[PDB]
UniProtKB/Swiss-Prot annotation:
Pfam families: Pkinase (PF00069)
Catalysed reactions, semicolon-separated: L-seryl-[protein] + ATP = O-phospho-L-seryl-[protein] + ADP + H(+); L-threonyl-[protein] + ATP = O-phospho-L-threonyl-[protein] + ADP + H(+)
UniProt keywords, alphabetically: Apoptosis, ATP-binding, Cell cycle, Cell membrane, Cytoplasm, Host-virus interaction, Kinase, Magnesium, Membrane, Metal-binding, Nucleotide-binding, Nucleus, Phosphoprotein, Proto-oncogene, Serine/threonine-protein kinase, Transferase, Ubl conjugation
EC number: 2.7.11.1
Protein name from the UniProt record: Serine/threonine-protein kinase pim-1
GO MF term (any one): protein serine kinase activity
Expression by tissue: Expressed primarily in cells of the hematopoietic and germline lineages. Isoform 1 and isoform 2 are both expressed in prostate cancer cell lines.
Function: Proto-oncogene with serine/threonine kinase activity involved in cell survival and cell proliferation and thus providing a selective advantage in tumorigenesis. Exerts its oncogenic activity through: the regulation of MYC transcriptional activity, the regulation of cell cycle progression and by phosphorylation and inhibition of proapoptotic proteins (BAD, MAP3K5, FOXO3). Phosphorylation of MYC leads to an increase of MYC protein stability and thereby an increase of transcriptional activity.
CDD domains the record matches: STKc_PIM1
Phylogenetic placement of the source organism: Eukaryota, Metazoa, Chordata, Craniata, Vertebrata
Residues of the signal peptide: none
């Protein structure tokens, strides 16, 4: 074991998730991402299936780990004196969705449809594995530019999926639902759908719709870019004020705006010039 297995590269990013570097598994020259999280900054702790103290983030990552490429895969992890290090897979080339939108502005709907659709599949796999992400946003989605495949990252605000009410939340406030802002209460699925509405608006308009608490609770959507009525309808549906008025995942994916999605490789060929 140890750090004789990986070769540390350049720092890729840092924030409330920790510090993530580009790395390479020395044994087979595999692209990886090495994430460092400080023990003092870990508020949410969980217990591993076998029974050990590790970040909830690790527990969640293991539960969503499969051959399905829609969620980042945890290849290994290590416990250090005052930190945990997570070895995650790393697509190359890659660009996260926030940077992609920052550079390209509002996305054409065919592209938003392919991206949104893949996020939905990804979120669904999480929930099917009994994991709630709680921080769906553009900064937490990676685009494998060659394959046109999206990957959901950063499970550091997540939790075990449950049917009961959540009274805690440390995700992004501007993607958080009116029921959280006003009452510090939300249910997993409907909160997720609310953030998915914020993400879709972000994709087709080039920016989030709400910046202030006042705006979230009002829930009034103004489209700053030209967006089809079908797309506006689905966004509006995802951003319903009453959680029970929001669509299920099945309803979102059955929506008329979501029909005839491009396959990922097709998406890369048309829009990511691959
Ligand atoms: O895997 C990654 N490749 C990248 C390339 C550029 C910028 C960020 C990243 C990654 N970040 C991660 C952050 C939290 C995770 O749980 C997993 C990956």
């Amino acid at each position: 074991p140890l750090e004789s297995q990986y070769q540390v590269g350049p720092l890729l990013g840092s924030g409330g998730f920790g510090s993530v570097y580009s790395g390479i598994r020395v044994s087979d020259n595999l692209p990886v991402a090495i994430k460092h999280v400080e023990k003092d900054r870990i508020s949410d702790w969980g217990e591993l299936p076998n029974g050990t103290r590790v970040p909830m983030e690790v527990v969640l990552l293991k539960k969503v780990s499969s051959g399905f490429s829609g969620v980042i895969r945890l290849l290994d992890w290590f416990e250090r004196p005052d930190s945990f290090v997570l070895i995650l897979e790393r697509p190359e080339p890659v660009q996260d969705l926030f940077d992609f939108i920052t550079e390209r502005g509002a996305l054409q709907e065919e592209l938003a449809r392919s991206f949104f659709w893949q996020v939905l599949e990804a979120v669904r796999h999480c929930h099917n594995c009994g994991v709630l992400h709680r921080d769906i946003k553009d900064e937490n989605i990676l685009i494998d530019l060659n394959r046109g495949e999206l990957k959901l990252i950063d499970f550091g605000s997540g939790a075990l999926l449950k049917d009961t009410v959540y009274t805690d939340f440390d995700g992004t406030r501007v993607y958080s639902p009116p029921e959280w802002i006003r009452y510090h209460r939300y249910h997993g699925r409907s909160a997720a759908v609310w953030s998915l509405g914020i993400l879709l608006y972000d994709m087709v308009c080039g920016d989030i719709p709400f910046e202030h608490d006042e705006e979230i609770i009002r829930g009034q959507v103004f489209f700053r870019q030209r967006v089809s009525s079908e797309c506006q309808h689905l966004i509006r549906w995802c951003l319903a004020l009453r959680p029970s008025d929001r669509p299920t995942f099945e309803e979102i994916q059955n929506h008329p705006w979501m029909q005839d999605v491009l396959l990922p490789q097709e998406t890369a060929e048309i829009h990511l010039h691959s």
